[PDB]
Amino acid sequence: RSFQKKTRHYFIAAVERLWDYGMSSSPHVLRNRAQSGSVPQFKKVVFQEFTDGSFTQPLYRGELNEHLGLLGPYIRAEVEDNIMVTFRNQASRPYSFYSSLISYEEDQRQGAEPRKNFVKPNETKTYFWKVQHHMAPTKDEFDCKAWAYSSDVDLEKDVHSGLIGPLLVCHTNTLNPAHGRQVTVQEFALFFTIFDETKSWYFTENMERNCRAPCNIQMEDPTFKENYRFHAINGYIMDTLPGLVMAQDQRIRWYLLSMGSNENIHSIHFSGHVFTVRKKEEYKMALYNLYPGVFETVEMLPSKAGIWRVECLIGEHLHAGMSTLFLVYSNKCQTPLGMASGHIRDFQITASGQYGQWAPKLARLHYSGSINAWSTKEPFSWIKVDLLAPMIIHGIKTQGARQKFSSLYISQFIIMYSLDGKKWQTYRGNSTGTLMVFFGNVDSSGIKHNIFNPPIIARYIRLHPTHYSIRSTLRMELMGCDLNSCSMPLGMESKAISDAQITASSYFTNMFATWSPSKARLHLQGRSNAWRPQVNNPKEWLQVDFQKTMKVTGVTTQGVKSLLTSMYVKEFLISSSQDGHQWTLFFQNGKVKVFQGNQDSFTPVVNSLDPPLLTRYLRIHPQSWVHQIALRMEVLGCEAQDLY
Amino acid sequence: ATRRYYLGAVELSWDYMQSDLGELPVDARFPPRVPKSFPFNTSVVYKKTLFVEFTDHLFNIAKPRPPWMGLLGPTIQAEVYDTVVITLKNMASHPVSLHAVGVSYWKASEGAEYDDQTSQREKEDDKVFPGGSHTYVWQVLKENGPMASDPLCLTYSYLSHVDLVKDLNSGLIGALLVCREGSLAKEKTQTLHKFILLFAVFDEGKSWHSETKNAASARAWPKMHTVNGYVNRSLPGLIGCHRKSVYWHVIGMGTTPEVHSIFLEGHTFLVRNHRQASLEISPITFLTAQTLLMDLGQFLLFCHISSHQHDGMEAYVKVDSCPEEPQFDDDNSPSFIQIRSVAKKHPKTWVHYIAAEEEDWDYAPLVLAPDDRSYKSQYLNNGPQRIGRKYKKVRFMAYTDETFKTREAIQHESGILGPLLYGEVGDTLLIIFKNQASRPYNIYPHGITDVRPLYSRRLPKGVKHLKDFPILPGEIFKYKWTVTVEDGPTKSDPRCLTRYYSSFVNMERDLASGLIGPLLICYKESVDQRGNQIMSDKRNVILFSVFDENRSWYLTENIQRFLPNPAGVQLEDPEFQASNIMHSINGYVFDSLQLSVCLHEVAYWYILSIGAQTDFLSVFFSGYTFKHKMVYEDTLTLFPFSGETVFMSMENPGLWILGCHNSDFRNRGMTALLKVSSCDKNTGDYYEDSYED
Numbered sequence A: 001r002s003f004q005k006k007t008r009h010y011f012i013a014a015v016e017r018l019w020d021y022g023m024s025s026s027p028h029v030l031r032n033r034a035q036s037g038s039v040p041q042f043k044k045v046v047f048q049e050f051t052d053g054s055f056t057q058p059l060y061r062g063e064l065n066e067h068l069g070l071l072g073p074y075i076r077a078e079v080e081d082n083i084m085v086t087f088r089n090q091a092s093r094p095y096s097f098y099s100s101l102i103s104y105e106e107d108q109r110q111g112a113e114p115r116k117n118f119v120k121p122n123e124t125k126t127y128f129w130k131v132q133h134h135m136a137p138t139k140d141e142f143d144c145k146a147w148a149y150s151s152d153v154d155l156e157k158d159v160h161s162g163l164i165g166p167l168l169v170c171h172t173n174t175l176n177p178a179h180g181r182q183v184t185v186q187e188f189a190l191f192f193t194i195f196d197e198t199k200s201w202y203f204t205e206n207m208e209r210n211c212r213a214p215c216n217i218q219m220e221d222p223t224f225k226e227n228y229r230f231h232a233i234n235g236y237i238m239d240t241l242p243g244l245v246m247a248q249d250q251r252i253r254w255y256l257l258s259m260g261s262n263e264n265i266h267s268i269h270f271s272g273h274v275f276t277v278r279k280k281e282e283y284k285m286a287l288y289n290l291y292p293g294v295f296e297t298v299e300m301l302p303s304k305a306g307i308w309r310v311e312c313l314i315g316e317h318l319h320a321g322m323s324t325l326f327l328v329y330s331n332k333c334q335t336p337l338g339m340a341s342g343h344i345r346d347f348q349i350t351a352s353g354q355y356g357q358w359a360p361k362l363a364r365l366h367y368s369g370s371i372n373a374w375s376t377k378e379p380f381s382w383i384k385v386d387l388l389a390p391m392i393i394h395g396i397k398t399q400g401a402r403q404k405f406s407s408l409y410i411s412q413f414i415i416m417y418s419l420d421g422k423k424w425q426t427y428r429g430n431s432t433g434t435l436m437v438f439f440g441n442v443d444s445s446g447i448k449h450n451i452f453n454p455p456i457i458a459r460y461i462r463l464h465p466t467h468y469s470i471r472s473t474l475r476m477e478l479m480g481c482d483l484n485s486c487s488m489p490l491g492m493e494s495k496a497i498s499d500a501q502i503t504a505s506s507y508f509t510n511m512f513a514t515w516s517p518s519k520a521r522l523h524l525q526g527r528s529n530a531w532r533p534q535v536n537n538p539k540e541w542l543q544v545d546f547q548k549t550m551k552v553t554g555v556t557t558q559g560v561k562s563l564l565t566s567m568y569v570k571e572f573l574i575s576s577s578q579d580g581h582q583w584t585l586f587f588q589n590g591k592v593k594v595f596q597g598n599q600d601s602f603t604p605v606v607n608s609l610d611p612p613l614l615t616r617y618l619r620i621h622p623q624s625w626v627h628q629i630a631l632r633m634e635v636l637g638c639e640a641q642d643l644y
Numbered sequence B: 001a002t003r004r005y006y007l008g009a010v011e012l013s014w015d016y017m018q019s020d021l022g023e024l025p026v027d028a029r030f031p032p033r034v035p036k037s038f039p040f041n042t043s044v045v046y047k048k049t050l051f052v053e054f055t056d057h058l059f060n061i062a063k064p065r066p067p068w069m070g071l072l073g074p075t076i077q078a079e080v081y082d083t084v085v086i087t088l089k090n091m092a093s094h095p096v097s098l099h100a101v102g103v104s105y106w107k108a109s110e111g112a113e114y115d116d117q118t119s120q121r122e123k124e125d126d127k128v129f130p131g132g133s134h135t136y137v138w139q140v141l142k143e144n145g146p147m148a149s150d151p152l153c154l155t156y157s158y159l160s161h162v163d164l165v166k167d168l169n170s171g172l173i174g175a176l177l178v179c180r181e182g183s184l185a186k187e188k189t190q191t192l193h194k195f196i197l198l199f200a201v202f203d204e205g206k207s208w209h210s211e212t213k214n215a216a217s218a219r220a221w222p223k224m225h226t227v228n229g230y231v232n233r234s235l236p237g238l239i240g241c242h243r244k245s246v247y248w249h250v251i252g253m254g255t256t257p258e259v260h261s262i263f264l265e266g267h268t269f270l271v272r273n274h275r276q277a278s279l280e281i282s283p284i285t286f287l288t289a290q291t292l293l294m295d296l297g298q299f300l301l302f303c304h305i306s307s308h309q310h311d312g313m314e315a316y317v318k319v320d321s322c323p324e325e326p327q328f329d330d331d332n333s334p335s336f337i338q339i340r341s342v343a344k345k346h347p348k349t350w351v352h353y354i355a356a357e358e359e360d361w362d363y364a365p366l367v368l369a370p371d372d373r374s375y376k377s378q379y380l381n382n383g384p385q386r387i388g389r390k391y392k393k394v395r396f397m398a399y400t401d402e403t404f405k406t407r408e409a410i411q412h413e414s415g416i417l418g419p420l421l422y423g424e425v426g427d428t429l430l431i432i433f434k435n436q437a438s439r440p441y442n443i444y445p446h447g448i449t450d451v452r453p454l455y456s457r458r459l460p461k462g463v464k465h466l467k468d469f470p471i472l473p474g475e476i477f478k479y480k481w482t483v484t485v486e487d488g489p490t491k492s493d494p495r496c497l498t499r500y501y502s503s504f505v506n507m508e509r510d511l512a513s514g515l516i517g518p519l520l521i522c523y524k525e526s527v528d529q530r531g532n533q534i535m536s537d538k539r540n541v542i543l544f545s546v547f548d549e550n551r552s553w554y555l556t557e558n559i560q561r562f563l564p565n566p567a568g569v570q571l572e573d574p575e576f577q578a579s580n581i582m583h584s585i586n587g588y589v590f591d592s593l594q595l596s597v598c599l600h601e602v603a604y605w606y607i608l609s610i611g612a613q614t615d616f617l618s619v620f621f622s623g624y625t626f627k628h629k630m631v632y633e634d635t636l637t638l639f640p641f642s643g644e645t646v647f648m649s650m651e652n653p654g655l656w657i658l659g660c661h662n663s664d665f666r667n668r669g670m671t672a673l674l675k676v677s678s679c680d681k682n683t684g685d686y687y688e689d690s691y692e693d
């Protein structure tokens, strides 16, 4: 006796918490007199989920639910089956769970509403209905509905101090059978509104931090009126909203269940982005005036990346918060951060122990007898990295090294990240668990190419060996693609750029030798592979009839190493033009910027570009050669408007 | 091509000017009057700055472009694909930008200044400055087109996003449209009916300089309410044809929750594919629509609400002869021989020996509670300067014995409302109506169009439209309500749009007192139903309302009775005022009705609201809470724009005790709530056909 025919249970409760925002404050007494300092905190209450052991274990979540705002948990559920919502109190005022679909409630001289009203705190209770169709998605798509839940004790008083739930549904064969819900596309719920407080929790809440600020008339009316008014989606006044990891070119669906008082009719906008909707057809829009209590879901799509926003175009409630940026990426790049190639300098790193010269300054193929990697010991080790800034990470790679006979690797690690060390996230991911347990290798040269996606962001990435072979240790070159989805190869190496587009000055040709620019690309090899001018002057130049304009995030350089006398290029300059007649040197912090690069030839090196140049034509001139003036190379950029 | 526009921002001053009329077109004009300079009894003016025209650079400065506009920033129509280009020259003091809202960008367009990792020359045109003229760019995307289900042209606009607030209010916006491929094809040769309304709330008293301490500059004080930028009936342009229709392009705007509704003293509007006539419009929306324009003359397109009228928003729209280019009781029910099923099509006219008399009404009979209960008691229980509970008002009755018939009697399961009245399309109504009250009142239907007192299309000697006048002193008048299709349901709408009627002795006031009723409208011809004797079928009606007795012609006749002291009572203060403002919700307050809905009782609720203004949330919360279908099925929801309406299918498979959602601040525990039942047993029908009657 063991099969299955549809049903879903969800563990959830209503706890209280602390609420604020901000990310820019003032020092102990950086102004000995008096200025800022404070931090408006609040005692609201939302919905949490787990298993049964109340607190300790395992009231927990996080990850793709970052954006969850105060909001309870995404209580999904296909159709026809049954919603099992077990609920436990966890605070003052006996609140109560509820949704318009608490339907199919027995009846028999009782009261399915005059009785199930409120539940005294401490005490717990469950609700459990059937997924009738007279409440769900229709033949006219938009695969999942958008219902809603919140307490029906006072009806509002509740609602204000947080405590709000987005119950959606979908239809039959639609949601990742077992462990998961949908994914065919991505789902996000943004609850717009206007929090007023006072008309909310009560006592202590409205009593945290007291006195009277600059230019006051009275209290309980002319006091800090619109101050206690939070204008935000999921409660993130000002562009504070978290979890919006997009996905350029992946159909998306938003659930915008608004609600509030009678002013909350926020006409939402999606910073440069249209979309569709249904109500018996493909009616399309670019705005939506969620009426307090509405719900409607919508289906859009990001054609391009970068960071954008969303906000109640109602000048006021906007110019007062309510607005957020949704960082979208270009799954098409996942370029290596360069932990093998120089770039990432030994500088950036750290762990907790060198455990024998084996250390952070070593990682990924670096070969040298037996001092070619990092290593550790028994302790609950850990290694961290600092990209020098924040970036997106499509994933990492991993290896090992053998010491004499016996070999060393790792078998399972957990990843932690953040953007200042101060904060720290124990990365979950798709698969269940209070954390994402990954998988190592099992020998030197493993290469367990894992892959966050849910892609991650931060500046700092840590790795914590949970299991290993005799001795923890590793190498790596984790890769990402960065903030505004850029930094990826452009022709040159991929040979995706006609060697007729690369013109240039001196092009010494010979009876064997033939260094025509046509052969001047990174890693490239072959006969007379690289570029060499007629004769090595301190000026010269190489051209790239880019054709279509472009946004350049930087350039990589090299140098061949021919017949017992290799040669690179140390110093140099770069131009820029809008055709082969006008040029604009790249000055920096002041006059020209002497670009420093190459200390050898058996490797490539790259220059940043604080202020990204962007032209349909690029020239380059070297300065401090070596033996001669050879050069092989490629650039770095990401498409952008043209024919203008 | 892929057409390129050149926009400016010339800081000019606004008129809101008078005259209106016409102007005499093609070869020899003369805009009206020209009486010289001195005080033209003055016309206040403010100074703003709005996007503009220009073919390259030029100087210019003055009045409006194409009469019906001027203000409204330059309209930008476009096909799909063929990309558009701009180039704004900030010939103004405001640094303002230009947005887009509804298309492709590149960061080279979303005029903003927020944390968007990108740096200058990405945030360059994302915010210009004085004298500086910067160029703009964006494309028309396939992902941006219509929906083969959407009209051919989407109402969209733009503006300078550098802080909406202290911007918009000066004139930062224009019209933006996108439509199905090769479209410069038929617009460039036929439809001179490319008109675009622009309902706006210019708060010109927020955008230019400050002071406040009650002689060269320019500003005065506060609020506005306009359209395309005009007011008090003014605003030139706006002219449609006869047999042909028109297409409306609207654009909300007010930089604040301040809403604004709007009918057409002359029509019904077409959005989606639903008759709605009201343009339920929000603080910033892009609603398109149209109008099969029968009739002729001029109609007061205007904002219908509260204090938005004298403040403007009203604007005339004319029509004209267009050219033509062709190539204890109960026991009765008879019976004889059944003719199987019996067809017999076409319409028939309804009869209604109905009238309107006086009577005192009360919103009881429920629990009491003095002193303490300072809420659920300031009303139902009277005091030294309170009367509540019962007031003397006047409704509509079907009357059972006047000199001209009857056919009535009624349950309380439908309050003060007026005896409902179906209306099949084509069908016609005969409402033999007669006063029987003190002050003469009237009765007109708000949803129909052909309302001429049968026998003759004339009018009480001197007069214009029965509404505004034809009061009846205790007289008796015969009415005829004929029903075209224009007056009723499309396809996309569930057949049976709710509606209503009432007096127009003035155009509103009487009402409050008590005169009101529903008036459905529907259509079909497949297989109907009915009943017999005192048994109906479509009695599912509900309507919430704000009845301010403080305005009913019977405040004195009411008071001098129910009030202790004669008339010693106070004049009028927030005190008792609000203590004499009971809230109907079908005229009953807090609790009553509880209705008779059964189990699986497939329901069909016809609902609406009246009284005072303010959108409204409203729902069912019972032994199922309940959902319904306004096309799609919907949650704790129902947002009717007051003095407006929509019905709703409510298949009832729920239960009992239905908190009937008013879901709105004070309104909730002030009075509304209500409940619903959950019966069982009693039913009949017949196997395969019709028979029970």
Ligand SMILES: *[C@@H]1O[C@H](CO)[C@@H](O[C@@H]2O[C@H](CO)[C@@H](O[C@@H]3O[C@H](CO[C@H]4O[C@H](CO[C@H]5O[C@H](CO)[C@@H](O)[C@H](O)[C@@H]5O)[C@@H](O)[C@H](O)[C@@H]4O)[C@@H](O)[C@H](O[C@@H]4O[C@H](CO)[C@@H](O)[C@H](O)[C@@H]4O[C@H]4O[C@H](CO)[C@@H](O)[C@H](O)[C@@H]4O)[C@@H]3O)[C@H](O)[C@H]2NC(C)=O)[C@H](O)[C@H]1NC(C)=O
Pocket (backbone or CB within 6 Å): A183, A184, A247, A249, A250, A251, A331, A429, A430, A451, A452, A453, A454
């Ligand atoms: C972590 O979580 C994330 C999400 O939370 C999970 O990642 C997601 O995984 C699913 C796979 O289960 C991915 O969905 C895939 O979608 C592609 C669509 O590719 C086409 O279209 C792309 C744009 O979408 C449009 O076009 C679609 C047309 O197919 C249309 O439906 C849609 O509405 C859009 O309009 C475009 O970028 C592509 O270039 C391409 O044109 C689909 O192909 C995937 O697989 C299908 O599978 C069936 C059956 O196997 C095949 O018959 C189809 O042809 C598809 O191809 C696949 O199968 C063939 C063999 O059958 C195989 O050879 C081929 O390689 C394909 O695998 C799939 O449905 C979704 O995109 C991911 N989300 C992300 C991040 O993008 C992770 O699973 C989870 N785990 C991890 C890794 O952490």
Ligand SMILES: *[C@@H]1O[C@H](CO)[C@@H](O[C@@H]2O[C@H](CO)[C@@H](O[C@@H]3O[C@H](CO[C@H]4O[C@H](CO)[C@@H](O)[C@H](O)[C@@H]4O)[C@@H](O)[C@H](O)[C@@H]3O)[C@H](O)[C@H]2NC(C)=O)[C@H](O)[C@H]1NC(C)=O
Pocket (backbone or CB within 6 Å): B231, B232, B310, B311, B312
């Ligand atoms: C559009 O039409 C509106 C229709 O009313 C115009 O309103 C008129 O506005 C003018 C000034 O703009 C008012 O003129 C003043 O009227 C008062 C009389 O009423 C006032 O005083 C009483 C005294 O108790 C007070 O209770 C009222 O609230 C008023 O404040 C005179 O005493 C003044 O001398 C002055 O003439 C008109 O009264 C007002 N009409 C009304 C409503 O009676 C509006 O100005 C027009 N604007 C546009 C768009 O052109």
Ligand SMILES: *[C@@H]1O[C@H](CO)[C@@H](O[C@@H]2O[C@H](CO)[C@@H](O)[C@H](O)[C@H]2NC(C)=O)[C@H](O)[C@H]1NC(C)=O
Pocket (backbone or CB within 6 Å): A121, A122, A123
């Ligand atoms: C009854 O309710 C009380 C609170 O009203 C609960 O008390 C909490 O108990 C948990 C452990 O079960 C503690 O972690 C909290 O600190 C307690 N809250 C406080 C300070 O009151 C109690 O658990 C409930 N059950 C009973 C009867 O013990």
Ligand SMILES: [Ca+2]
Pocket (backbone or CB within 6 Å): B107, B108, B109, B110, B122, B123, B124, B125, B126
């Ligand atoms: Ca720009």
Ligand SMILES: [Ca+2]
Pocket (backbone or CB within 6 Å): B110, B111, B112, B113, B114, B116, B122, B123, B126
């Ligand atoms: Ca910007």
Ligand SMILES: [Ca+2]
Pocket (backbone or CB within 6 Å): B502, B503, B504, B505, B506, B507, B508, B509, B510, B511
């Ligand atoms: Ca009236």
Ligand SMILES: [Cu+2]
Pocket (backbone or CB within 6 Å): A264, A265, A266, A267, A312, A314, A316, A317, A318, B257
């Ligand atoms: Cu707002």
Ligand SMILES: [Cu+2]
Pocket (backbone or CB within 6 Å): B259, B260, B261, B303, B304, B305, B308, B313
């Ligand atoms: Cu209005």
